[PDB]
UniProtKB/Swiss-Prot annotation, chains A, B:
Temperature dependence per UniProt: Optimum temperature is 75 degrees Celsius. Retains about 55% activity after 15 minutes at 65 degrees Celsius.
Protein name: Sucrose synthase
EC number(s) stated in the UniProt entry for this protein: 2.4.1.13
Family, per entry: Belongs to the glycosyltransferase 1 family.
Mutation effect (residue 564 to A): 2500-fold decrease in Vmax for UDP-glucose, 2600-fold decrease for ADP-glucose
Species in which this protein is naturally found: Nitrosomonas europaea (strain ATCC 19718 / CIP 103999 / KCTC 2705 / NBRC 14298)
pH dependence of activity: Optimum pH is 5.0.
Source organism phylogeny: Bacteria, Pseudomonadati, Pseudomonadota, Betaproteobacteria, Nitrosomonadales
Length: 789, 789
């Protein structure tokens, strides 16, 4: 399906009529909904044309002026074509991306007095490796291993490649690691390894390193091969194997164990960061929870890896954020703050300053933050360098501000850089680029988008929680995808902004918290002592903390859900699709948690209409004695035991939100063991595999969805066996895919592999560096200096 | 010789005193002369140290504040080292250019607020072929032919060659050239060449192309292989050789003959251009003369090459400059003016406009011309494309403005770009880079030097008139060299500004004209109408015409000078050294043409104060009747015969300038057969082979100069015999190097060979292009919108 496919000139009046329908100038820029809408009638006059339907449904946008229509097609994930067609004589003509963007720029902001600067990464990226198939997008590291090992295999030469050198350039706290001297060769190294392996063969496996150490030093080995002798033999045999005939599995496993990761530096400069005073501050969401739940697992794995290799040194993680004097109550005024559940992890707060600074007291929003970032980055470099012994081994950027500071610092210190955007707004606010001048005052998107572009191009690897975050779906463009080509009129045009097939992209999903949410079938950890309390809240009555509706009749199964009550999550729509279809009304009861239940005056916020719609929907249908509505926000421990309590007896969790980005709570539920019916739109699509790990449901189809629920409830004498099929499938799904432990081993390996790639590919990328740096200085710097005006 | 040559701690007392003598802080920035001064007193204290003299004489500059001295050392041509010495405990420390330039920055303008932008062309040029020996600089085309053929060999050994495709892509005036089919296939072309050749064997030499064309066309061949069968044979044989085994000479000979070039665009937007009338106007000069005496030669050559290949089209040359609606007494408001002496060569004039423009009527100085140039370039592009049939084949820029325009124009059109700076002022004005802030109001160097860097990097080849214009001397850095690294405070820093060993640099030296300056010995062509007028200029006297000589020495040898009366042309030095030496006084008589003088102003103030010293030195030492003097300006056709007259009756020319970049005067003198005594300082060093083509004199020692001249006058019978040897020496040196015919042959080849190098090397250069385009948009554009306020 392409420009050739408008050969739909077989029915010419159809195409002509369609273009006419579009051309009526209401909006000259149409998105999908409009573009598709116009298909139906034409769809009467004249004909049907499944081909034409295919085409139109693949249109991302169009720009109509004059007798000219400029189309952007997206036939398959991450592939775009551009064309323009003449209203009267209808000949599809292929366009370059520059041509199409020039047209959009003209139609929107008018003919130009000066030539636009086109930022183009194409020349810079030409020649570096790319994934080929789009199903593969999001596992870079695999591809990268195969490329690295394939390339490395021509060590039939002086090899190999630089692995022998690379092995020598890491030292932990001044102590040289893996090799006493860098002799290179590889005939030498092969021999030393051979001798060492020989000696080892004659010692007991359990000989500790401190015995091996001096005679290993003679053979040219510094420490870090292992703790005992078995592990030394394992590691060295790995290297022997790679030096003989390198392979991707072997090279990954060996790289993964090099004791090079000691010091982490994580950037999150926006918001009020802090511990547990969170949940609802300005610019603070589960933003905090990702980082906090991660660093615990991270620190553990760091320690385990180093331990196994016999390096005794204690790892350190610094979460750097802003020191705000003006907190006054929350910890945000506190420079060093130790993190819970962690030995050497510390929050390090740093002040914003003026050029003379001058500590700059009050909180600043993320949209205003840009002018402070370079100064902040200098300051952070100083303080973080001082709190660690020296350079960090890895720098992890968070959101757009964190990624930018990561960029600056990482170029300054020469450190492997990982970016985590968590989200990129350019796609969520459609047309915020072409219309950027509209939004500069509130949103400040010129600064933020430029920062974005700079950073996704500067990173060594890029972590994302979902595939969709990167390349989207067949339907929707993905978040990074949005940056491949775009226009900022009066600023610049970007083409080749990001290569979705670059190996830098890795999906590493979060998971857990496994101390709170875990399976109902766990022998040890369940909190039995809250179970009486759980049953109070559910099956008993009245109002003391918000309620009510007193099911009684509870021999029946249970349908459970919990969320912030508001419109994305669509609780109201759940209670609603439960209202009609008396089949599942009679088949099961319904529990709801999260809510307010009488907003009062004074205070609340936002929706509150969700409350009115809830009480209203519950008054109608006679929903009490069926549905228990609880308006507490609960508690971690409590929530966890509750999920587990819904399993036994064989209950289910249903969240029909409209769209969920990642969907943490789906994971929490699944981790609990209970079968989950989740949104079809966003993360849950990837998280649950339908009728193995759980079930997909359409929110807007809830009428029909209600009858999927009842069907699961029937299923072999009131659903004993299949419920357990889904339960175990869910458990297995979480265990195999979404857990902070896997996350952390993956992350710890990635830093190693990508540090090596950086080590090899480093020189070749220097032109890219100069280009990014010239952009930062001559484009970003002024944009952030236009703030503060 | 180098950094370790400050091992002079062998005598470190002298070193300490040299540093202390430097640190006296009369200046922070110490240049060459003031560095050499510091070695003489301290001289009589303490010691001598030849090693130290070597080291000091190789310093280009040093930067002093604090205990610390920073040194820039230039050991040999185009090779630099940088170091720092501590005043108290003195040990040398090797510095990178970046380090040295940073300190230069943070001293003169003081500590930086934010990080400087370092424009770095290094990663971009990495990989491109470059010369090795400094004595080879400016020879570029030769090196390039060697790389071209060297690479063509290995490519032709594998499947393909770009030579064939490149042969395909030039169709002069709509008709296909060299090849009928588009065949990319080398075996095929070998076959066709074979047949074609064998078929030419059967016809005889002079068969005109018109006859061969259809038989040739059955064979796959379009025209342009020759005018008759002889020549077609010749060039098809060249291609056959090349396709078998490439070699540099054959390759250059074949490239040299391709009918690629029918259209020149020569750019000179500043000054008042015009045919004649222009000497003395603002921004104008002999600047125009280069262009005007070049283009006849050029036009002729271009036509010839085309004729020989049997292509009949009429070539066009456009000299494009500014339309100034203010006549200002001139022809400068005329849009299209035919250059006289040429068949198709035209000055096309184009107005400057404002952003609504709105033609700007008034003269604008070169120093202020920056903001108009992009607008100008667009306008030139349109008008010129119209006036030529289409794209020009080569674009030549002149000066800084011309070169920036050519940069813009050539990137838009995809045309080979030649740059002629004629001079680059960064070395002319001391510290005008580091101090650029001072000089902005007058000079606007922030714009100039930026455009300079841009253009030097953009051009496909750079023509200069001498070696030193590029790389200078053992003492002097060159005009281009100075852009290699420099700082421009509050704008940027450059390193790797230009590579002097890049093959793009070619010395192509002009001369003559040649209807005017020609050998005194010619069978024809001489002007005898002038011959009585001549004698009466030297020999008559007093009040009947400009004064005051009265020689009266009939057969006495002549010593001729003709110049401006100003300080650096230095006529004062010549007359002074003439009076000072009695033997020289006895051997010849000194004739002088220049100044207006005649009375001191009226007219022509105020620098003609040199008339003071003129009369002051003429009356005392009792000059008259020894030395004639004319205040005339000498209409050129006359002066030509004046040179022709000063030989037989024999005489000499003397150009005792203090410094002379090229010395066109000298070229003219030698062209006329005069033995020439020319200044050692500047291009005359290159032009005259001493004691073959002429003699070099140090205008500083008058004793030795006049002595040398005398010694020349005393040879044999009084020089029958060695005046003639040098005279023929000059004649031959002029026909073998400086002639516009030679210039034209070389230009017309350079455009073909660099056209092919662009063709072949362009895709690899794309990252360099994007970098330069970003630099332009984000750096130049702003600097020139500052003007323009």
């Amino acid at each position: 399906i392409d420009t050739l496919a408008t050969c739909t000139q077989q029915n010419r009046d159809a195409v002509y009529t369609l273009l006419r329908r579009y051309f009526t100038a209401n909006r000259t820029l149409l998105l999908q909904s409009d573009l598709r809408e116009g298909l139906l009638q034409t769809e009467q006059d004249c004909g049907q044309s499944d081909m034409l339907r295919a085409f139109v449904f693949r249109l991302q946008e169009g720009i109509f002026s004059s007798p000219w229509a400029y189309l952007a097609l997206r036939p398959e994930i991450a592939k775009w074509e551009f064309m323009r067609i003449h209203q009267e004589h209808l000949i599809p003509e292929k366009l370059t991306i520059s041509e199409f963007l020039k047209f959009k720029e003209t139609v929107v902001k008018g003919e130009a007095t000066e030539s636009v600067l086109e930022v183009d990464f194409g020349p810079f990226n030409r020649g570096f490796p790319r994934l080929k198939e789009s199903r593969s997008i999001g596992q870079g590291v695999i591809f990268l291993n195969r490329k690295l090992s394939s390339e490395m295999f021509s060590r039939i030469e002086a090899g190999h490649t630089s692995l022998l050198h690379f092995l020598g350039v890491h030292a932990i706290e001044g102590q040289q690691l893996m090799f006493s001297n860098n002799s290179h060769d590889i005939h030498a190294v092969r021999n030393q390894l051979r001798q060492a392996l020989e000696m080892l063969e004659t010692l007991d496996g359990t000989t500790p390193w401190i015995e091996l150490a001096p005679k290993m030093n003679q053979l040219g080995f510094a420490p870090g091969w292992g703790h005992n002798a078995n592990r030394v033999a394992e590691t060295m045999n790995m290297l022997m194997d790679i030096l003989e005939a390198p392979s991707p599995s072997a090279l990954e496993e060996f790289l993964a164990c090099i004791p090079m990761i000691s010091r982490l530096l994580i950037l999150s400069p926006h918001g009020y960061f802090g511990q547990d005073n969170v949940l609802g501050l300005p610019d603070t969401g589960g933003q905090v929870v990702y980082i906090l739940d991660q660093v615990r697992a991270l620190e553990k794995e760091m320690h385990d890896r180093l331990q196994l290799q016999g390096v005794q040194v204690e790892p350190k993680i610094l979460i750097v954020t802003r020191l705000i004097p003006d907190a006054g109550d929350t910890t945000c005024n506190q420079r060093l703050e130790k993190v819970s559940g962690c030995t050497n992890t510390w929050i390090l707060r740093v002040p914003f300053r003026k050029h003379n600074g001058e500590i700059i007291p009050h909180w600043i929003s993320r949209f205003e933050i840009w002018p402070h970032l370079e100064i902040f980055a200098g300051d952070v470099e100083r303080e973080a360098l001082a709190e660690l012994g020296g350079h960090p081994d890895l720098i992890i950027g968070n959101y757009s501000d964190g990624n930018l500071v990561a960029t600056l610092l990482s170029r300054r210190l020469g450190v492997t850089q990982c970016n985590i955007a968590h989200a990129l707004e350019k796609t969520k606010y459609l047309h915020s680029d072409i219309y950027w001048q509209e939004n500069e005052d509130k949103y400040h998107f010129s600064c933020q988008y430029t920062a974005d572009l700079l950073a996704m191009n500067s990173a060594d690897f890029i972590v994302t929680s979902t595939y969709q975050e990167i390349a989207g779906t067949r339907e929707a463009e993905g978040q990074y995808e949005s940056y491949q080509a775009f226009s900022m009129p009066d600023l610049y045009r970007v083409i080749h902004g990001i290569d979705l097939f670059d190996p830098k992209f890795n999906i590493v999903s979060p998971g857990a918290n496994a101390d709170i949410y875990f399976p109902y079938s766990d022998p040890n950890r369940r909190l039995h002592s809250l179970i009486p309390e759980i049953e109070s809240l559910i099956f008993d009555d009245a109002t003391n903390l918000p309620a009510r509706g007193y099911l009684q009749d509870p021999d029946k199964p249970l349908i459970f859900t919990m969320a912030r009550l508001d419109r994305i999550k669509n609780i109201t729509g759940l209670v609603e699709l439960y209202a009609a279809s008396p089949r599942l009304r009679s088949l099961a009861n319904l529990v709801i948690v999260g809510g307010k239940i009488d907003p009062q005056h004074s205070s609340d916020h936002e929706e509150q209409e969700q409350i009115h719609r809830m009480h209203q929907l519950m008054d109608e249908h006679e929903l009490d004695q069926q549905v228990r509505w609880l308006g507490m926000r609960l508690d971690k421990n409590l929530a966890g035991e509750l999920y587990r309590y819904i399993a036994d007896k064989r209950g289910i969790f249903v969240q029909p939100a409209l769209f969920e980005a990642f969907g943490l709570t789906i994971i929490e539920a699944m981790a609990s063991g209970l079968p989950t019916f989740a949104t079809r739109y966003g993360g849950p699509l990837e998280i649950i595999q339908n009728n193995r790990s759980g079930f997909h449901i359409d929110p807007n189809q809830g009428a029909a969805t209600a009858d999927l629920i009842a069907d699961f409830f029937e299923k072999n004498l009131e659903n004993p066996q299949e419920w357990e099929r889904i339960s175990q499938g869910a458990l297995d799904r979480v265990a195999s895919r979404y857990t902070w432990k896997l996350y952390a081993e993956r992350m710890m390996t990635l830093s190693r592999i990508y540090g090596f790639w950086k080590f090899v590919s480093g020189l070749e990328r220097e032109e890219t560096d100069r280009y990014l740096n010239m952009f930062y200085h001559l484009q970003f710097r002024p944009l952030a200096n236009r703030l503060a005006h």
